Structure 1
């Protein structure tokens, strides 16, 4: 009976620790995924804007080559 009493309490401890560990890991995974996702969204936006700068340069270059006529 004493052996059983010991098993019950160590079970209780193990499940509480496992609940904590799982919560901690899930939250870490979520915050990492979210960070990566938001950063990628920002990077995509800046990439598009930077393409526009590229295009603007191209336009001004094109004007200058047609004024060499």
Structure 2
């Protein structure tokens, strides 16, 4: 009976510690996944905008080509 009493209080501690561990890992995963996703969206937006600057630096390149002809 004393052995069972130890096992019950040890099981209660294990399940409370596991609950704290599961929450800490779940939150760490979500915050890391969110940071990667949001950065990837901002990087994609800047990629399109920086590509537009490449197209702008190229349109001006065509006019300088034809004005000297």
TM-score range, shorter chain: over 0.9
Shift of 1:61: 0.6
Task: Give the TM-score of the pair, scaled to structure 2.
Answer: 0.98
Task: Deviation per CA, 1:4-62: give whole Å up to 9, x if none.
Answer: 00100000000000000000000000000000000000000000000000000101110
Shift of 1:65: 0.3
1:1-69 equivalence runs, <5 A: 1-69=1-69
Q: Distance in 2 between matches of 1:51 and 1:18?
A: 49
| Runs (5+) with no aligned partner, structure 2 | none
Aligned residues: 69
| Runs (5+) with no aligned partner, structure 1 | none
Shift of 1:68: 1.3
Task: Give the TM-score of the pair, scaled to structure 1.
Answer: 0.98
